[PDB]
């Protein structure tokens, strides 16, 4: 009678039991092949990362290599969870705006390929806002490659009032790597990337003001921090700390022409009803790895306060479990009592097909 609760993000998998208050599997999204004249997923490739071509199934939230994708779907149950799909009712994730054919075949899969006996198919931003006790609020879930605003009135977001910026975690790590090559580092392979992940982590955050932190950093050595590299040179950096993450706020950055968070976010509550914005201006949730940084909640607050009615009481919500609150979203609502009509049965499935999931 236990669910199971899979959050497949584009970077990494998190996945566990319903009813748990953390995943108990969180491994990269990637299966690995070696280079030179048979496969190797998760944490398996992660090992041998050196020897391996990775590809990662999942692009932009969205599930773009199905044959790879059931292979890290079969990994997280036999390997990580040790789990025979069969004999649990599986809760998985999708992104915004996932297009109505890959949920048919996300659930076609589960049924066909790993016989669950029950399914379910929710929205990512939707589980986090679930996950800090709210059915109205307006989501801001940013993970490693793709960043959304979603509005959600009544335990439902609002599909027309989605937005979407093709920017996220990764983008910012490869901008840190430019910057560093350019100071004359060289990060270039597969691991020299993710030491730059781990920098980016560990360092940037968000100024309150770029201008002024750009000032004080031009006149001052008190925002410089230093990083042990592996062959154990030390990498200083200051402003690289926070032009790194203000990417999010202006994607020209790296030469993208779209709208910057604070932006996407503000757009967003103007597409919703009028009378629900006060709301959403309340409960502004951040959910993902990249909104970690220290400063994004403070900045939001100061840019959207710009942009809002004078009168208009904002606040954001920054959970300090929020590189996992998609996946604990999920597992209270795949606990809930309410939610045990809503799965989708294989005997639903053996009748109607993969359309029953909408
Ligand atoms: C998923 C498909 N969907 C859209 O895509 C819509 C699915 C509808 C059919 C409902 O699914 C039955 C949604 C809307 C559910 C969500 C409820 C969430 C899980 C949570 C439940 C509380 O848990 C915390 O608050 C955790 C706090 C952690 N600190 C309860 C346990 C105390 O409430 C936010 O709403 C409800 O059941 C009622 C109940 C209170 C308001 O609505
Ligand atoms: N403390 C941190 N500060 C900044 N970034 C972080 C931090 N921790 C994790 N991240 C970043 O968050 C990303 C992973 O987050 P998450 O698991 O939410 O994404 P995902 O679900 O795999 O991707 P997506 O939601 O875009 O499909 C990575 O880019 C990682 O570098
Ligand atoms: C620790 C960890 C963080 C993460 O988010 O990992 C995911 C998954 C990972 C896959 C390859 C990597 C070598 C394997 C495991 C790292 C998993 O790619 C990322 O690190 C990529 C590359 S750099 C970056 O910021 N996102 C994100
Ligand atoms: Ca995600």
Known sequence: ??????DNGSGLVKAGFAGDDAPRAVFPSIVGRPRHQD????????????????????????????????????????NELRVAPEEHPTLLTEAPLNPKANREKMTQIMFETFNVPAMYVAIQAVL?????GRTTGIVLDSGDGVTHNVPIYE???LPHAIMRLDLAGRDLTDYLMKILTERGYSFVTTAEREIVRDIKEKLCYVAL?????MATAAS??????????????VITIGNERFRCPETLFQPSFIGMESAGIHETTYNSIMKCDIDIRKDLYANNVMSGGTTMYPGIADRMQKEITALAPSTMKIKIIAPPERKYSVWIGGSILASLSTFQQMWITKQEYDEAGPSIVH
Not at 1 to 6: P, R, S, Y
């Open 1 to 6: 009678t236990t669910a199971l609760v899979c």
């Open 39 to 78: 496969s190797y997923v998760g944490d398996e490739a992660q090992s041998k990362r050196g020897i391996l071509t990775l590809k990662y199934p999942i692009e932009h939230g969205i599930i773009t290599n199905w044959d790879d994708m059931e292979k890290i779907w079969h990994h997280t149950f036999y």
């Open 128 to 132: 986090s806002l679930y996950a800090s």
């Open 155 to 157: 335990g439902y977001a």
């Open 209 to 213: 003001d770029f201008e002024n932190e």
């Open 220 to 233: 001052s050595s008190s925002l410089e921090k230093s990083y042990e590299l592996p062959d154990g040179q």
